[model samples]
Target chain A: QQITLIKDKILSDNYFTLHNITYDLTRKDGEVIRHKREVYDRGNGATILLYNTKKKTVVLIRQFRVATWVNGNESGQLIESCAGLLDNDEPEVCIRKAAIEETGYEVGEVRKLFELYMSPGGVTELIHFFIAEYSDNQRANAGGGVEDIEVLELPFSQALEMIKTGEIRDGKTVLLLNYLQTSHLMD
Target chain B: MTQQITLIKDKILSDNYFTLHNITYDLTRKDGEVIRHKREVYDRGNGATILLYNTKKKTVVLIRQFRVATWVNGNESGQLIESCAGLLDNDEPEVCIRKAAIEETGYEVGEVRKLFELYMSPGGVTELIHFFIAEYSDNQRANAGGEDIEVLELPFSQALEMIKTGEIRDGKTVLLLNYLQTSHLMD
Candidate 1:
């Protein structure tokens, strides 16, 4: 396979980023095709499901996501696992920090499940997924530093049912929830 | 690059095919602290994705395509394998994925059960993906089109293993794969 960058342009109009790239691709059959695509870069992130095996509960955070609100989510507020952007840190470092900050739980010995491109069609964003066990004594502070947060500790079994009940619809939240069930991590 | 949220005002930045907004909002902290901030919200419309599985053969169909978004990030060849999906433009979610099923994999499917809906990237992008699963077979092939997509039919077990091996890294794809594993869809 051969690939050559032909043109790259960044639209300065958008505050975040709208990158347009044109490239030449050579397939396995020796055919060359030029492709152009606009990719919105919102940066990459990491997410974690903080679970306690002994108590059969998981820590999750609730916050308002303006993006979801404008797009038919009547309330725009969503319940999701502890997550944050990996600005200049490693995936493990980011998720661990996010866990303590969002849920007030400093989890130990995190297990990385896998990394995935959340939306590959037109977005340049990938999220690292992880799971860790937390004890009640791990709570440090109030969790929310400057941002408003509502942390909930729901039974693991109850959280799984939320997926089917439409109460939990955020992509990464449901992904980690189902993963915990299929892997039987809490069992 | 900054704060997590707030809401005071909104303005448009880019609105060609999609949209990017410059929003400023008043964020009230938990402890009676008030602050104003700015964030960018990108709206690229919502989409639908479906996982086509075969109960008789215990196999699943996936589409492999050159995703420019992944290419510019880390994927060397830009080739990514994921469940058949498409952007929902002026169509119902059910109608969208059903047509995407046939057009992308030539699998004429009907009665697709909606698993759930989710915001793919809730932080900044408003891409809510409606997920679904359906039983399919070889006798249901039909005419279709794509962005030069190559369809592959692999054993259901292999698809699940791919997630652990990092071969299947699309979030939506992994979510559906685990759904089948937990729901006993292939059994």
Candidate 2:
């Protein structure tokens, strides 16, 4: 038997959607049970990790995060790959467009690695992951500083080291880095 | 001087199961320009996740359950494969994970070591996940029953393939698997 959705009652209609979902599940014992759960909907997003084979470097950006700040971050800033919400665009198109705004890199092609639910326990957000080969010649930004972003290029090894030092604590960032590592992208 | 940021107000948007706020902040630019920003922030509390593996069997234990959050997004059937995890029962991540291990998988794991404290989604959600790994054995299994969770034992290599085939799309699960892959845990 398949799971069936009974009702999706929106509990909050603020900036993001929050819902109290009621569903029915059929157990192995030939019994159907009703269950309810809370789900947070902030929307889906895509993230891209730009890597240079020639320089063995990766591009990252630092920005302010109020959510992280209020929790425990002292500076409330995070270093992560270029990312943006998927606004009616395919995941690939979303990250390709995101790279230009955040990293200033005009990437024409990006290979998507995989997509994963960032926090599926209760949040309805899936992050599409991608990695693109970047050349220094593709630079299109107005130099290093944006009013809200700091573009950074670091050696792939150093970036991996940053994960160890807790300087790169973002989940999407770590996922891409480790993806490269296990795949031996540098080698 | 660096750009200065201060929280002006945290207006509540929702206080249902989790808390969501419309945060107002003042950002003082480097050239002495002040800008007020409004961002929606969700606080869903932190969680801890653990990956249990048996070197002798070269297999890892995972949990498959229905998650309404992912279901509303694009997850067909709504069942998600993920590492054993639970929300914080206070700030005691270690204790909570151990309790979760017993309740969910019926495994009394030993010598579970912390790997990373990852910010799952720093952009809009204040959810930090404490990741861990542990060695397990058949003798350690105890009588346990929790939710609609089905236990899965997968070969280390098979699990990696699932990441590529999209069977394992949970971020916490992928992180632990990637870590294991890089370290050759099966070997």
Candidate 3:
């Protein structure tokens, strides 16, 4: 299946943070088979979870919002692992920056573990997962210009247990904590 | 010639779900000059993810929801067979799974096993999906009531058939099944 291009992009707007919009042409056999149009949103961002082995703790953020819960369930507001949205910037760079901004810990030697998209059919968000190591001493003065209201620190083991018992309700946190547990990274 | 990336302009169209960026990149040949112009590419998305697992009953617990916007004029209208998924929400993909699993399935998974992590739609959307699997028991299944109103538990065999026949239309579902099969997770 070969597609011939005709007209170039006619529109570009960034009403949203990173989302974009565009128009394209799909021609076949010198005939315009389809004039495909789409509102291309800016791709989502990247985030990292910071873990400290010596202190047996992980950095987390606590925030309350009506949107995150069902029927504005305040109980749904949660405490979650360190994370931040990817800005309109490079992923690795954004993640490194997010880790420090959200957790207040300067991450040293980041390791990219996995990458995934949030929702594909409509939302153009991608997530690059990484693990950053830091010490308890580094936890001081963390979370300066973060998006949320508070950043809570917790024991990494307890966080893993929360995942096991269905207590932690943050998606990425669950995966990150679980990964650390099953992989015995802390051990 | 090297490509050129130009940020025409960005406006905030919406802030409820996520921000959308309408951007245009002007492509030109390098060599210190411009080429006639190559094809224009459109990228929409940051990234997203899906969670999965086999139950003791050999059933796969999947969720079906009506995606509001895509439900109209798009293929994802009536029913979508997908694992509990969601935006990164200022968190890593793995961390996001913690919240997604609870909200969608209400099952607190333990030690999430990394199943597959790959790009769902790379052509137009930059969404990457991180898929994970955990063993589910009746106790966990009973507590599944949060955001998702409906749940479907299908035998792994039947689920695979639906994917093979294309009855399961979600791209992530298809990708998850293909990964499971190729990775010999089923065998």
Candidate 4:
């Protein structure tokens, strides 16, 4: 249960459409003062990452970007697991939906493994961890879009080895993969 | 790395408190749309406070309140301690100076010994917490504040013992007590 909904009403909603930016400020309660910065809400819609074990492989998305890691290598982009965020009224529902959309693999019996504060000191976004099981036959069409990308579906063990070899760089994905490997659920 | 600035072409979203820009940018590579967020910088000033009390033997006035933001899945209660503390809410300075002692511990601390002001978490947020200590007597309990209070009674030595024994788990209090002990402040 939410103990306090700090922001009372939307005082302002400003966005930099070109920069894809938005900022909202509102009234909030304080112990000593009448108002304080309740929250600094930022970021896009919630994201979801899926790890399908049925195929004995992990689904990863690769995209091109220059600013990631201060390198302009288009090939050095990344290979990562499926993830999602809290969208509507129910966070779990949003995550589950995202898993299906991003990975195109239906999951069953989802269980929460961990909760991480991605950027605790500044951002308020919390990463909700989840694990779901699926079978080989469940793999269908799963890719972000067709620009310049690669969707590598490799064995889970191979993914782990790649991580040890300095391959996987996504922080959240690495944590989730570690949890899955340590739990022996990948087998 | 080269420096780049965004030029605002139009306003996508705007309100009294904040404004969002639909802008463009110039980079070595092609510029595209991305999200950016800006918020009002709230300036909150500083003050001094204390947390102390005396009971059957020795009681510490502690404040425990639920923090709603971090309250999610497993972490249900974000109950935290504020040794008697009040912000410099008024220019008078001393008006609410004793509010912390009354509200947090229910003790009327007079002329608290100056300690220090420390940043709660410097890397992430700006919150300068001014800390102080005071001595109290059992007779001060008659005027406890109406707010919810968690009274703890233990001698100075026992209080430190409680920390190791898992009875007292307040982070700042434990740190202060340890510092005092190591420095022989109570001797």
* Residue B46 error, candidate 3, Å: 19
Candidate 2 at residue B44, lDDT?
83
- In terms of lDDT, model 2 sits at 0.87
Q: What is the alpha-carbon lDDT for the whole of candidate 3?
A: 0.53
Q: List runs of model 1 lying over 4 Å from the truth.
A: A13-15, A27-29, B1-7, B28-33, B144-146
- The DockQ of each candidate is 0.60, 0.69, 0.04, 0.05
Q: Write candidate 4's Cα lDDT for A1-187 as tens digits.
A: 1244344444333421111112222222333322222333333223334456556766665543222322222342555555554545365676666655666666666776534443221224455556666655665666443123346677888876775564664545555566566456666
Candidate 3 chain A, poorest ten consecutive residues by summed lDDT: A65-74
Docking class of 2: medium
The most accurate candidate by lDDT is: 2
**Which 10-residue window of candidate 3 chain B scores lowest in summed lDDT?**
B35-44
lDDT of 3 by residue, A1-187 (tens): 2233343332434332222222222233444343332334344556577777778777777644222321222442455555555566777888877766767777778887555433544544445667877875665575664433367668887876665454564455655565565446788
| Candidate 2 error regions (>4 Å) | A143-147
State each model's CA lDDT, in order. Answer: 0.85, 0.87, 0.53, 0.46
Once superposed on the true structure, which residue ranges of model 3 sit more than 4 Å away at CA? A1-14, A17-42, A69-72, A146-148, A164-166, B1-187
Q: Candidate 3: deviation at residue B18, Å?
A: 13
Query: What digit string (tens of lDDT, one per residue) describes model 3 on residues B1-187?
Result: 1234333443334433333323333333345553231122233333344445564455666787643222322333334677667666577867787677777777766667765444332222334455676666666653654522466777788887775454564545544554454444445
Count of clashing residue pairs in every prediction: 2, 0, 58, 22
Can you give the lDDT of residue A124 in candidate 3?
41
